[PDB]
Amino acid sequence: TLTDRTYLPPLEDCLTGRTVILSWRLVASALEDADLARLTSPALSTFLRDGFVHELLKHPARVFEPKDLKQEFETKTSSGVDTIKKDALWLADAVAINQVAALRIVLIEYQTRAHSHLVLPLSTQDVANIQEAAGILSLLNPASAVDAETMWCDFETEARRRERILATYLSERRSFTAAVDALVTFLLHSAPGQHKDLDSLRRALLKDAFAFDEDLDVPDRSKLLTMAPTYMNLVEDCIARAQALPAKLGESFKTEAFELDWLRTAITEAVHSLSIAFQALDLDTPYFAPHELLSEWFELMNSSLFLESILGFEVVADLAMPARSLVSAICLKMLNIDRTIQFLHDFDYPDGEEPYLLSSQTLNKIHTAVTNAVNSGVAASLPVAFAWSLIVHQMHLGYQERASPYDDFLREQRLDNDIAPVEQIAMLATSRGQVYQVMSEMALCLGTTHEAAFRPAVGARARLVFQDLLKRSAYLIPYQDEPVFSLLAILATGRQYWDVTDALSASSLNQVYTDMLDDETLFTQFTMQAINRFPYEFNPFSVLCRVLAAALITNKDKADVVTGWLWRTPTLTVDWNPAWDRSYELCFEDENTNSFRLTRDVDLFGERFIIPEGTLGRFVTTARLEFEHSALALLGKRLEVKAAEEICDSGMAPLDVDEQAEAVAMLATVLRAESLKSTAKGGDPEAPLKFLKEASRLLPHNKDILTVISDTIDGLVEKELLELDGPQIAVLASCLQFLHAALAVCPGRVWAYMSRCALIAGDARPGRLSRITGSLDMYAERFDLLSSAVKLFAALIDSAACSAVPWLGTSEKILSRVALAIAQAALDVYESTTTWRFRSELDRSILVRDVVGLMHKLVVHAHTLSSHLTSTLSPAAAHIISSFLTPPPSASSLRFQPLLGTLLVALITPRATLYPGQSRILAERVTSVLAFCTSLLRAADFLGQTHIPLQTHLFQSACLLARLPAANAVYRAPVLELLRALVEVAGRAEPPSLLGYLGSHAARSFISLVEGIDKPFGRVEHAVVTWRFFAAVIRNRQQWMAGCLLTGRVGEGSVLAAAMERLREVKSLDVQEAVAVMDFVVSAQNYWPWTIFAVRKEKEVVDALRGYVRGLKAPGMVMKTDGAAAAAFQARIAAYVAETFAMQLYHMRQMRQAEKFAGELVADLDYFLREGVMVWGYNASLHGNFARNFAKRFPGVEVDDFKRTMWLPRELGKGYYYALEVAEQMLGFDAGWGGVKQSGFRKEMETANLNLSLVEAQVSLFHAWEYLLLELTLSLLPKKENAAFARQVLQVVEQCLEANQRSQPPENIFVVLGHARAGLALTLLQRLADANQLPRDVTHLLALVSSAIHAVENPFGANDLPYFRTLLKILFVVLRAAKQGVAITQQVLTILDRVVARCFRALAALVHTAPEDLALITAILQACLSVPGIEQCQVQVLNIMAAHDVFQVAVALFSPVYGELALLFLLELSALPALAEHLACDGLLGHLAAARLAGYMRRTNVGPFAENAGAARCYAIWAKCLLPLLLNILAALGSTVAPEVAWVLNQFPNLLQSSVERIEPLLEISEIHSLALLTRVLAACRAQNARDVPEVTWDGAKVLECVEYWLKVLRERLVPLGPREVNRLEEKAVGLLVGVREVLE
Amino acid sequence: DVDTYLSNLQTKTTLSMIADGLERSARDFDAFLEENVTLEWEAQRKRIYQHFG
């Protein structure tokens, strides 16, 4: 019941792309990098947890075995398939593999054609671009290059396709081998402290495959130890294929390149098989292996000549050396010298397995194999031959003492009588330490340092055999410098100073290091001897202490061993000075030992180091002294004496230059280890301080070890750096490393020294670091200096970044100057590195990585914050920015060629499963380069840079980054982030066409490669990165790329194809990725709607249902329930969904298909009504509490100082406003940030950031819902579903009015809400009044508006004018709606008493902007005086309206838009009878006849269409406002005011003439009616008396004829100019005519 | 339908076209207030006429 359902998914998914095969390429990378996300992904988890994959990896011979699988092949290929089937059949016929494996490989190659095409040579356009960028860097091949058309036409050929298929087959074999090796390694030597998911997966895989359960006291090792022969037998077929290529393969393909590729693949497979076998063997170290397999393996090795026949070529040396090393390692492992000698001498059975010593045939075979290997003249057999010689010597010694089965072997080959052959073999192996040299080389290739060919654990487990061999060959071989240096090179492996970390690992890795102290042999033969030979032999003891301190950082059991050995050294050994000949005497105790005792009181260095009289000593023939002392103090004193340039004839000899370098290096390593272990829990914080105090002991009180290093540096830098020997450069590098180490515990003195180091732009004295530039050769001796100086500078910058704090003796100016000098030095190094010639590429790669990381940390630290905390490095950051963004035109390419060369070397590097150190170093270098490019892009975007000369080079750099990911998948997310940053920079600055730099074929390949959003794994980080990249590329002016990415060449396999598949499962998908998916959707819709909306409508049945589901089951208050950080994510998702629905409804309305969709969506606004316009979820209480708690504990640093400078896109998480990524390291130096049980300031800051993100999401949802409801108000015009619509509108308005009164958010963090949410309710009420569907419930709605108007501070004329205007319009519409509907008079009189009067008085006082505000106030008063409740409260409101005496100020302002508005205001005031008569009083006629407007009124230019603006304005003011006011004042009392109106008429007859002459064969009909009513009333009055009304000055005949001749032709002169947004006037005209007929007839 | 939709389409962000609703409402508010004051004056004249009789 073990099928390939998950191993080989159906062909339909592989072709359609619904499920990409989890090829071994990806699995090998995940197991090699130990990535948590990928290893814990559902796809890979299910793939590995399957029993089929377990059986396959436990029997790799079955994966590619020859067998009749025609049935399975035909069943799979049935239910572009013809070509796949043909290729699979051809591959199965050529190679002996099964048809299923061939089909799987062909499918994998088909799915990975993008990489195979991008790893091809570049076209001519790219070569031209590179040559133009270059103005070293010539590693590319420009001579050999063709166009893209010829390259693509040749790619689709048959021969090239078959060659690429074979290459992919070999690559997949290598990837499978590497993946199974890494899996076995991780399952056997799993590191502790890993994630719970990793441990669970490991235990599950073990229980499923090998039943290896950790809970059982004795797990089943059978299935784990049975893996050795499975690979030892496959090695046979591997070497057979290596020595003979497939015969059935076509001869045309058997070319030199193909033969070399096949040989390299076979070598890699053999190496991986040997590594897996070595792991399976060392899993059970003490017990022996089955001799039945060792005999066969030795026979195979004898037949194959230790793979020297296939490795004999000179073109596979890189792969041959590690192959030979691993062969020697596995040979020494199977020999098991440690247990072999124990069994020989002790004669004690292992009780675990029968050893090969009981079979004489196996011994004879091993002996003849070793003899043949030694006779063939091969170096790989040196260690194995030496081990076999030692074994034979021990067996002969045992036989002679006895004189059992080994006797047959000893006697058959004649070795019984003579020991000449093995003796000669050992002699020729030890001659000139050839065996030791080859062992050191193998260890270097099988070590932990980056130079190793395998992973750190692989080398740690491989060094065990060599260490055991040296242990068993130490007792027989006398102590000599050669084996000492061999063991040193094996253990240390020349590791770098910065290659030491406190990362806790499994005890298996540290076993190789602890064995030195566990076994008595390696402790009494090397450790004790190395300690005794000191300082005479300084290098062994130094390297031993260094490696031990680097290894035992986390081992608390042996954490004080190095400190103890350094502070309480048991013995001393130093060269003898002839001056001391008269200061000793031989005791004549033992002549062989040569013992003696001091007779005089020797005073060394004449507190100070003094030795007491009577100390014993031994002359080792230099002498050993048995005296207890602290070697650290003596070493410090010697270093001080050497730096002082003082020599003492009567004292000990000075340390050598190399010895001094090694001393300073070991001191720096020990100090770093102490500082790293002190921070860890359980240690002591006084470890580095105590170490420094002990080092500065018995030294001059004035100076310390730091002063000694300072003097040494000053001495070395005295002369120019160019003339310095290797030893001096090494001493300088060690001094820099020691300064780096001391930077942690004592930053103050380090900064004080760097301020006057005189090495980086210090002064005009020769010795500066910038004078080492030019076209020089930076070998290992000259590279160790800069590689350490750059890292020291990076550490100095990191320490200076923590400006929130030990620091006695520093200042802001000093740190600023030091940082500026460091930046200048780093820039000089970056500009000069483009000319040096390094012995290898790894050195230059590490240097570039270090300098780029330093520059990136400098740049990000400057813009990450905007407070004074980032002012120390501000000058350096500004200098770096000005130098990398606007460099001079002469030195512009010198700063750009390094990155171009780095990218070229990265994209032209061959992929190899070995040498993981170099691979990870190159990966980190590329990541740092891309991060630095992104930082430069963001810096250019910021500060307002209009001309970016770096963009021209970044385009051609992206031209290469488009193909670079093909070499490594890790470069996917960083390259996409760099492209996103470049697109963002190009947006805020059409831009240069990116398709011209990428290319048609290259661009299509990149699109087809990136369309998959982490399909094989499905991670969240890379997914969000890809979605943001797509959104940025679509938002910019990029059209061709956007089209090729959306359409896919509707869409069938484009990005939207997977975007929809992810959107249809948001109910279970991570909310984090949902935000990015929705952002991509919105970015594709707003810029490319015709495609996205079309595809969504064609598939809306899957999206609308999911949207409704999300909306219905989206609670409002999610904080109370389970979940705190997910609230902001859910709010953001809801906001995006609302925005998308609004855009879709807008498009449908534009297409007139938004009725049914809107009607169905309106029923899903529950979450909106719950948590929409309401922004009261700010919780200012906790924010204020946190601010107070931070200001009380940190008086200097404020909470607002951590505000981002908008340099990076603010993530909607725990770092929206407060910079947490930097705070974690800036405030984690003192107690208070960590807190117990995950408490303190960190949790509160995270909660505050989550609240801010939630508020931002709420504002986004508010905008989305505003747009949606604004469009729906127009869409939902008819009379249907009005109840729910009105309820929702009223609820939204009430929530807005309540939020306006409740606690407001800050103005510096978010945007001011004033005037932002008022127009929303304004337009809502406007449209609802236009529809006339209000429940006249203003009795309570006006309370909030009144409270807001009262608590607004009265900004009638302040800067916040829009807010006042929108509030006025809102209250206007509210009181108008109320008028349509008593308990309302007492609630509405407040605005008539306190609001309108106060605002009018303020406006009149300010006017001494104003016109529109006064008109709005006039309209407000007019609409408010029409409420029915006021018709009865006239007597009550008379007093509150006359208390202010607004009539006086109105008439004053009237004495010309201001006059018109004042006239309208007094008119609306006269609407009441009391106010009507008050205004009709004599107070009016006075100013009416004395007004200055009479000057213009008397002029004959008055008219409605007069060319003069003033004349028309006055005519309008008189026609629209004066006549209604006259009628109103007359309604009160006409008999008394008749003389006044008669005089006003007969005094200004021009208006009457213009009114009666304009109309010949509307606002003028109202004038006609007013004149008719006035005539009627004055005639009725004159009917009694004759004194008043002397002349009527009005004609009836003309008016009668006019009204007769004006009752379709009427539209001749009807051109409304004012109203143009809405049958309208004819009704009013006929009504006025009927009124005139009623009053006149 | 799709043919005409693509023919009469303009290359510009969609969120800017829908924003025209705010401007349209602001421009129609003037005419709305004008009609309001006009009908208010009409009602005032009607009540005055009913009072005179």
Indicate the pairing of strand A572-574 with strand A616-618.
unpaired
The total number of residues shown for chain A amounts to: 1641
Question: Which pairs from A1158-1161 meet CB under 8 Å and 24+ separation?
Answer: A1158/A1272, A1158/A1275, A1158/A1276, A1159/A1281, A1160/A1104, A1160/A1108, A1161/A1108
The reply to whether A1418 touches chain B by the CB within 8 Å rule is: no
Residue A490: CB atoms within 10 Å: 24
Q: Quick one: A1231 and A1173 in the same domain?
A: yes
Total of domains in chain A: 6
CA distance A1417 to chain B (A): 12
- Give the chain B residue nearest A1034 (alpha carbons): B13
**Amino acid found at A1421:** L
Helix (H) or strand (E) holding A595: strand A595-597
Check if A749 contacts B (Cβ < 8 Å): no
Question: Does residue A118 sit at the B interface (CB-CB below 8 Å)?
Answer: no
CB A1554 within 8 A of CB A1601: no
If asked whether residues A958 and A991 sit together in one domain, one would say yes
Using CA atoms, how far apart are residues A1216 and A1310, in angstroms rounded to an integer?
A: 11
- In this structure, are A518 and A555 located in the same domain? yes
Q: Which residues of A touch B17 (CB under 8 A)?
A: 1146
* Sequential DSSP letters for A1511-1565: HHHHHHHIIIIIHHHHHHHHHH--TTTHHHHHHHHHH-HHHHHHHHHH----HHH
Q: HSE (CB half, 13 Å, CA atoms) of A1090? A: 14
Residues A1205, A1230 share a domain: yes
Are A1422 and B51 in contact (CB < 8 Å)? Answer: no
Residue in A271, A330, A228 with CA at minimum distance from that of residue A454: A271
CB contact A1620 to B (< 8 Å)? yes
Q: What's the CA gap between B49 and A1631, in Å, rounded?
A: 12
Which residue of B9, B17, B49 is in closest CB contact with A1090? B9
Structural domain ending residue among the three candidates A1234, A1252, A1281: A1281
Angle among Cα A1556, A1560, A1566 to the nearest 5 degrees reads 50
Residue A1122, in any domain of the structure: yes
Helix, strand or coil, per DSSP, at residue A618:
strand
| Identity of the residue in A1323, A1369, A1423 whose CB atom sits nearest the CB atom of B40 | A1423
Identify the burial level of A11 via C-beta atoms within 10 angstroms of its C-beta, where 0-12 means exposed, 13-18 middle and 19 or more buried.
middle
CA distance A982 to A1320: 37
Report yes or no: A628 and A653 within 8 Å, Cβ to Cβ.
no
Domain's final residue, options A468, A494, A520: A494
DSSP per residue, A14-28: HHHTSS----HHHHH
Place of tokens 């229980």: A207
Angle at CA of residue A1531, ends A1528 and A1535, nearest 5°: 125
- Return the structure tokens found at A513: 């290091």
Query: A416: which 2 tokens?
Result: 């019984």
How far is CA A584 from each of CA A412, A587, A628, A985, A1248, rounded to the nearest angstrom? Answer: 61, 10, 19, 80, 76
Cβ contacts (< 8 Å) between B29 and chain A: which residues? 1326, 1369
Q: What is the 3-state secondary structure (H, E, C) of A1238-1265?
A: CCCHHHHHHHHHHHHHHHHHHHHHHHHH
The secondary structure element, H or E, covering residue A573 is strand A572-574
- Cα separation, A911 vs A126, whole angstroms: 22
Q: Which helix (H) or strand (E) holds A624?
A: strand A623-625
Contact assignment for A1146 to B32 by CB distance below 8 Å: no
Q: Is A250 helix (H, G, I), strand (E, B) or coil?
A: coil
The answer to whether position A964 is within a domain reads: yes
Pairwise CA distance, residues A724 & A731, whole Å: 11
Q: How far apart are CA A162 and CA A152, in angstroms?
A: 15
Within-domain flag for A1309: no
Helix axes A726-745, A687-695, angle to 10 degrees: 130
Amino acid at A154: D
Quote the domain boundaries for residue A376.
282-494
Residue A1619 to residue B1, Cβ atoms within 8 A: no
Read out DSSP for A858-911? HHHHHHS--SGGG-SSHHHHHHHHHHHHS--SSSTTTTTHHHHHHHHHHHTPPP
| Alpha carbons A993 and A447: distance in angstroms, whole number | 49
Assess if residue A134 is contained within a domain: no
Q: What distance in Å separates the CA atoms of residue A107 and residue A84, rounded to the nearest whole number?
A: 7
Asked if B52 and A1423 come within 8 Å (Cβ–Cβ), the reply is no
Distance of alpha carbon A744 from alpha carbon A742, whole angstroms: 5
Same domain (yes/no): A701, A809:
no
CB-based contact A1017:A38 (threshold 8 Å):
yes
User: What token pair was written down for A955?
Assistant: 């385009």
A1113 HSE (CA, 13 A, CB side): 7
Please state, as a whole number, how many other Cβ atoms lie within 10 Å of the Cβ of residue A723.
7
A1050 and A1164 housed in the same domain: no
For residue A1476, CA distances in Å to A665, A698, A1480, B42 come to 103, 109, 6, 18
Asked if residues A1245 and A1119 have their Cβ atoms less than 8 Å apart, the reply is no
Q: Which amino acid is at A1386?
A: Q
Nearest to B48 among A1086, A1147, A1531 (CB): A1531
Residues A1525 and A1640 in one domain: yes
What Rg do the C-alpha atoms of chain A give, in angstroms? 46
Q: Is the peptide bond before A535 cis (omega within 30 degrees of 0)?
A: yes
* Chain A residues in contact with B25 (beta carbon < 8 A): 1270, 1323, 1326-1327
A348 phi-psi bin (left φ>0, alpha ψ -120 to 50, beta other)? beta
- Contact (CB, 8 A) for A629 and A574: no
Residue of A nearest to B43 (CA): A1426
Structural determination approach: cryo-EM
Two tokens at A1430? Answer: 């006021």
3-class DSSP string for A164-206: HHHHHHHHHHHHHHHHHHHHHHHHHCCCCCCCHHHHHHHHHHH
Q: Are residues A923 and A1035 in the same domain?
A: yes
Q: Which two tokens stand for residue A1588?
A: 């008043």
Full DSSP string of A1598-1633: HHHHHHHHT--GGGGG---SS------SHHHHHHHH
Between positions 1512 and 1571 of A, the ones with CB within 8 A of B are 1524, 1527-1528, 1531
* CB-based contact, A247 to chain B, within 8 Å: no
Which residue from B minimizes the CA distance to A1083? B13
- Contact status, residue A494 vs residue A449, Cβ threshold 8 Å: yes
Spatial distance between the Cα atoms of A1341 and A1005, rounded to a whole number of angstroms: 62
The C-alpha atoms of residue A388 and residue A366 are separated, in whole angstroms, by 8
| Coil/strand/helix, residue A597 | strand
A121 in helix, strand or coil? coil
Both A832 and A842 in one domain: the answer is yes
H or E segment at A585? strand A585-586
Q: What one-character-per-residue DSSP string does A1028-1076 give?
A: HHHHHHHHSS--HHHHHHHT----SSSHHHHHHHHHTTTTTS-HHHHHH
> Exposure pattern of A1091-1107 as b/e (b: 16+ CB <10 Å)?
bbbbbbbeeeeebbeeb
Separation CA A780–CA A582 (nearest Å):
45
Extract the tokens encoding A489.
């090179």
User: Which letter, b or e, does each residue of A1140-1177 get, where b requires 16 or more Cβ atoms within 10 Å of its Cβ?
Assistant: bbbbbbbbbbbeeebeebbeebbebbebbbebbbbbbe
Record: contact A1426-B32, CB cut-off 8 A: no
Structure token pair of residue A473: 């060959």
CA distances from A779 to A723, A782, A788, A842, A1358 (A): 15, 5, 14, 12, 72
Domain count across chain B: 1
**CA nearest to B44, candidates A377, A1565, A1472:** A1472
- Alpha-carbon span A280 to A269, nearest angstrom: 16
Are A1621 and B27 in contact, with CB atoms under 8 Å apart? Answer: yes
- Cα A102-A104-A106 angle, rounded to 5 deg: 70
What number of other Cβ atoms are within 10 A of residue A94's Cβ?
Answer: 19
For residues A1315 and A1362, the answer to whether their CB atoms sit within 8 Å is: yes
Which phi-psi region, left, alpha or beta, contains residue A1491 (left: φ > 0; alpha: ψ -120 to 50)? beta
* Chain B residues with CB-CB distance to A1622 below 8 A: 31, 35
For residue A255, being part of any structural domain is answered with: no
| Angle formed by the axes of helices A705-716 and A747-754, nearest 10° | 20
3-state secondary structure at position A586: strand
CA distance A1637 to chain B (A): 13
Give the SS3 label for residue A755.
coil
CA distances from A563 to A632, A670, A708, A1475 (A): 9, 9, 21, 102
Sequence-separated (6 or more) residues with CB below 8 Å from residue A327: A274, A301, A306, A307, A380
Is A1254 in contact with A1127 (CB distance < 8 Å)?
yes
Q: Could you tell me which residues are beta bridge partners of residue A624?
A: A573, A618
Are A1006 and A951 in the same domain?
yes
CA A365 to the chain's CA centroid = 59
Residue A1557 sits at φ, ψ, to 5 deg, of -100, -25
Distance CA A406, CA A361 (A): 10
Residue reference for tokens 């009795």: A1339
Q: Are A1406 and A1356 in contact (CB under 8 A)?
A: yes
Per the domain annotation, does A241 fall within a domain? Answer: no
In a domain, A1431, yes or no: no
* Contact call for A1323 and B44, based on CB within 8 A: no
In this structure, which amino acid lies at residue A339? R
Mark yes or no for CB contact A1524/B41 under 8 Å. Answer: yes
Lookup result for tokens 């510009």: B12
Residues A209-216: contacts with CB within 8 Å, 24+ apart?
A209/A51, A209/A54, A209/A57, A209/A58, A212/A187
Contacts of B34 in chain A (CB under 8 A): 1618-1619
Comparing alpha-carbon positions, the chain B residue that sits nearest to A1577 is: B52
> Is A1332 strand, coil or helix?
coil
The order of strands in the sheet holding A623-625 is A572-574, A623-625, A616-618, A595-597, A585-586
Under 8 Å between Cβ of A761 and A817: no
C-alpha closest to that of A1136 among A1200, A1207, A1074: A1074
Q: Are A1512 and A1505 in contact (CB under 8 A)?
A: yes
- Do residue A554 and residue A507 come from a single domain? yes
Contact B44 A1471 (CB under 8 A): yes
Q: Which of A1146, A1471, A1621 is closest, CB to CB, to B31?
A: A1621
- Discontinuities in chain B with C to N beyond 2.5 Å fall right after none
∠A271-A277-A280 over CA atoms, to 5°? 145
Q: Is residue A249 part of a domain?
A: no
A1326 and B43 within 8 Å at the Cβ level: the answer is: no
C-alpha separations of A887 from A460, A626, A821, A823 in Å: 48, 65, 18, 15
Element spanning A343, H or E: helix A337-346
**Stated length of chain B:** 53
Q: Which of A1097, A1113, A1144 marks a domain boundary?
A: A1097
Resolution of the experimental structure, in angstroms: 2.4
The residue whose two tokens read 């935000």 is A1075
For residues A482 and A627, state if they share a domain. Answer: no
Calculate the dihedral angle through the C-alpha atoms of A193, A196, A202, A205, rounding to the nearest 10 degrees. 170
Which residue range(s) make up the domain with B39?
2-52
- CA angle at A1061 for the pair A1057 and A1067, rounded to the nearest 5°: 155
